[PDB]
Backbone as CSV, one residue per row, in Angstrom:
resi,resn,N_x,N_y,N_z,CA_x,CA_y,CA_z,C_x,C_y,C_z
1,UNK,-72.189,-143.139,66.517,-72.066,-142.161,65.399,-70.689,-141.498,65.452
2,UNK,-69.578,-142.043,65.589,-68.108,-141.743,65.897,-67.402,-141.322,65.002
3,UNK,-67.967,-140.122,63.988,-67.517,-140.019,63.017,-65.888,-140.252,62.796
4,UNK,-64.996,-140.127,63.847,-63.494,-141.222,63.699,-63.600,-142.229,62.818
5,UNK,-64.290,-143.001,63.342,-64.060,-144.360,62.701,-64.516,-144.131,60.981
6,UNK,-65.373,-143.690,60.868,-65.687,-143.605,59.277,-64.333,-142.864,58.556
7,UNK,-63.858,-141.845,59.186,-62.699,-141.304,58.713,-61.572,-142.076,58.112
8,UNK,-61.064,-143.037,59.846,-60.045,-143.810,59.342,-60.028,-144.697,58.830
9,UNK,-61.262,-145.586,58.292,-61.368,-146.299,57.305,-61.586,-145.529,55.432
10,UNK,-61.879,-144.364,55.782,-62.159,-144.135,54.079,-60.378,-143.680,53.876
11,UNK,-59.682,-143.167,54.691,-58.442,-142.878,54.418,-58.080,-144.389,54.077
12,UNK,-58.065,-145.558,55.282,-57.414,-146.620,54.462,-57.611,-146.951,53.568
13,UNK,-59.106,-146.940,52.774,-59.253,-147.597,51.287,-58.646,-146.690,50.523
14,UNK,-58.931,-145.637,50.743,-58.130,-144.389,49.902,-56.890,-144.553,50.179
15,UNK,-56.192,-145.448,50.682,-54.654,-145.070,50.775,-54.137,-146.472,50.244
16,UNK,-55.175,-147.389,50.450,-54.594,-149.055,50.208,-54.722,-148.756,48.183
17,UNK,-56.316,-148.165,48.285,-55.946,-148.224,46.452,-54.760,-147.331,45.869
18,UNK,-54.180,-146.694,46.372,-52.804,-145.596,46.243,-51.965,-146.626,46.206
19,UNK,-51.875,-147.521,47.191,-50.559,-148.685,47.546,-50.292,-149.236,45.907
20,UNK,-52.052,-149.782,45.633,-51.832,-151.327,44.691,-52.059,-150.301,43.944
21,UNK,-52.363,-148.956,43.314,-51.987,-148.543,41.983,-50.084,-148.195,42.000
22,UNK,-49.427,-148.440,42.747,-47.780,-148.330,42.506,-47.326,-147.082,42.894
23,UNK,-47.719,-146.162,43.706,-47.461,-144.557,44.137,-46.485,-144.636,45.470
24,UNK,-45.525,-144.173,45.042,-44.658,-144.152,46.487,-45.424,-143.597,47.968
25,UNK,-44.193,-143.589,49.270,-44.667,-142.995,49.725,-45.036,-141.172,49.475
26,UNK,-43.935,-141.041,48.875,-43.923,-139.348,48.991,-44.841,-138.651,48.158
27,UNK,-45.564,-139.977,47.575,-46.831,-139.374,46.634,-48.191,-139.325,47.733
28,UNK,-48.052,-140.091,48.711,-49.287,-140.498,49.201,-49.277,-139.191,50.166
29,UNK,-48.589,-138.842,50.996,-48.327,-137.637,51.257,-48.527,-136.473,51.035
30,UNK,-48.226,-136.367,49.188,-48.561,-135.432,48.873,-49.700,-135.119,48.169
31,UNK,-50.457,-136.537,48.167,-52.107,-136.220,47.725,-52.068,-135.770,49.041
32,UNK,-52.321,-136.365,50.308,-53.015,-136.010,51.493,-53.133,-134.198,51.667
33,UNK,-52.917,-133.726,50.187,-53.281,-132.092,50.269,-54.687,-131.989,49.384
34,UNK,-55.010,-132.206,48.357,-56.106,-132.472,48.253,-57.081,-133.941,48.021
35,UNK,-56.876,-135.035,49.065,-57.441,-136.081,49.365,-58.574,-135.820,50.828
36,UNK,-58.462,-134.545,51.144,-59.817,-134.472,51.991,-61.086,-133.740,51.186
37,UNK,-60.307,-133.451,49.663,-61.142,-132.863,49.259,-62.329,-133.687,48.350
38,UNK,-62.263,-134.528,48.904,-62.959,-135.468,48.507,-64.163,-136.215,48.890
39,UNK,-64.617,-135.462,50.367,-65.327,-135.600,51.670,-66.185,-134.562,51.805
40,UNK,-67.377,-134.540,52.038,-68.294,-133.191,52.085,-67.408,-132.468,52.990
41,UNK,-67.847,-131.318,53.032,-67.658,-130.051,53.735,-68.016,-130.761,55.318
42,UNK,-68.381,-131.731,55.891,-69.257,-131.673,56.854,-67.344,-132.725,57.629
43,UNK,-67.160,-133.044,57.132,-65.757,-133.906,58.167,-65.284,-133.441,57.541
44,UNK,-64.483,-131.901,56.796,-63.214,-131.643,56.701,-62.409,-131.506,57.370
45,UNK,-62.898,-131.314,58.780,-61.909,-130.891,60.253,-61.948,-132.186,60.673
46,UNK,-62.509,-132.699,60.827,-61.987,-134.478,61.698,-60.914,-135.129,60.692
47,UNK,-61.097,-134.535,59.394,-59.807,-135.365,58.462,-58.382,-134.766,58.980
48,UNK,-58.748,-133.232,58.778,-56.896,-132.471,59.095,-56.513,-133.073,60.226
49,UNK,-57.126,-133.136,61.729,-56.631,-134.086,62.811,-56.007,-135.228,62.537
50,UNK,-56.928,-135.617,62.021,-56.675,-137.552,61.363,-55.286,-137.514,60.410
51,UNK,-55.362,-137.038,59.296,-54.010,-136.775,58.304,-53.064,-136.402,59.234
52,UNK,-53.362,-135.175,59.948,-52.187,-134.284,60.316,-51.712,-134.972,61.483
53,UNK,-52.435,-135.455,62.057,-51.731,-136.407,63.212,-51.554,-137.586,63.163
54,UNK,-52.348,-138.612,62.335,-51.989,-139.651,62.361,-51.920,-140.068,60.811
55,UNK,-50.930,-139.199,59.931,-50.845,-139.671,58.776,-49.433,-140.492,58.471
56,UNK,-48.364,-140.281,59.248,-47.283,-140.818,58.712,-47.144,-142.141,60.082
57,UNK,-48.165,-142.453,60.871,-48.203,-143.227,61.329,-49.305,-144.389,60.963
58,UNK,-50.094,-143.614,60.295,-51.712,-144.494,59.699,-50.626,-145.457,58.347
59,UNK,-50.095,-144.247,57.741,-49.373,-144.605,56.306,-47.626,-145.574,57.149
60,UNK,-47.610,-145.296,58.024,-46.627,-146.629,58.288,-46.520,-147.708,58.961
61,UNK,-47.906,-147.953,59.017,-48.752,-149.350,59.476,-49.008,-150.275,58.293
62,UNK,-49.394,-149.794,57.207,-49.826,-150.220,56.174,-49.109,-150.767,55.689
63,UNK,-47.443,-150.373,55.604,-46.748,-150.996,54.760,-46.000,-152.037,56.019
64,UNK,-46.106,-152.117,56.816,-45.922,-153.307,57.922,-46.638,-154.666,57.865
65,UNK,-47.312,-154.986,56.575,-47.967,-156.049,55.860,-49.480,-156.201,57.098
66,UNK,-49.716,-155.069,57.566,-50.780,-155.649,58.293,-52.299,-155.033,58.088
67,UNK,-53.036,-155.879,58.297,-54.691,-155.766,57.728,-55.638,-154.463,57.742
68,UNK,-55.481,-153.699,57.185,-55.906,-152.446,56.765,-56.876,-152.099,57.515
69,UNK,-57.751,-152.642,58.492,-58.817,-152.903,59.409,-58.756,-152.856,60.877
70,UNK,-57.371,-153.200,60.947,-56.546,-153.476,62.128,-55.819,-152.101,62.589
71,UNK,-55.808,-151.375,61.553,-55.410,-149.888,62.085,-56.256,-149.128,62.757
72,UNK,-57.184,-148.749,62.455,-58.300,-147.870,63.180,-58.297,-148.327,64.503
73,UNK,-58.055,-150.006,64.410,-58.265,-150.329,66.319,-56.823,-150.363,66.783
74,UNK,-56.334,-150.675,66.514,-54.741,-150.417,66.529,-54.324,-148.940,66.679
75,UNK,-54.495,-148.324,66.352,-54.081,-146.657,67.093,-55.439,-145.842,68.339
76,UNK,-56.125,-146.992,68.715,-57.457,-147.210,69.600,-57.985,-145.997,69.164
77,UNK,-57.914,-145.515,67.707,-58.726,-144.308,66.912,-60.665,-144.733,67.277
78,UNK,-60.666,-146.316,66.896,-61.896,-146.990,67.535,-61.852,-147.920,68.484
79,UNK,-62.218,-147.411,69.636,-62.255,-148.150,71.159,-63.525,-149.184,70.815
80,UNK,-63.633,-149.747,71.960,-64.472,-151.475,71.145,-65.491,-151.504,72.599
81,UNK,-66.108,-152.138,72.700,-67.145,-152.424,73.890,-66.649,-152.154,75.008
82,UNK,-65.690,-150.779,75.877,-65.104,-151.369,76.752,-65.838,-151.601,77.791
83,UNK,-65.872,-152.671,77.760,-66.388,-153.495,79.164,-66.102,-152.544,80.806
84,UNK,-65.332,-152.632,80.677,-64.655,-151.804,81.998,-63.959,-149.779,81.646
């Protein structure tokens, strides 16, 4: 129940449909002021972490042509079975 992971995936769809509607970066940015408002009341604080710390790094993965899916495990935001 890691509520992380649900986070950094609704930011990526929310940020990939920003990409392919044509919005620069400095737009995506500047939704990220009211783009949590878009989330119950119940993860507004796991978003400001998430944005505020990993927004200009979440948002400069994306444009590194790589798989929108691959970020969340890629900043180990979601750790995976660790075995050890």
């Amino acid at each position: 129940s890691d509520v992380y992971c649900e986070v950094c995936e609704f930011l990526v769809k929310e940020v990939t449909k920003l990409i392919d509607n044509n919005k620069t970066e400095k737009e995506i940015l500047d939704a990220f002021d009211k783009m949590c408002s878009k989330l119950p009341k119940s993860l507004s604080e796991e978003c400001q972490e998430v944005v505020d710390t990993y927004g200009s790094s979440i948002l400069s993965i994306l444009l590194e042509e790589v798989s929108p899916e691959l970020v969340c495990s890629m900043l180990h935001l979601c750790s995976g079975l660790v075995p050890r």
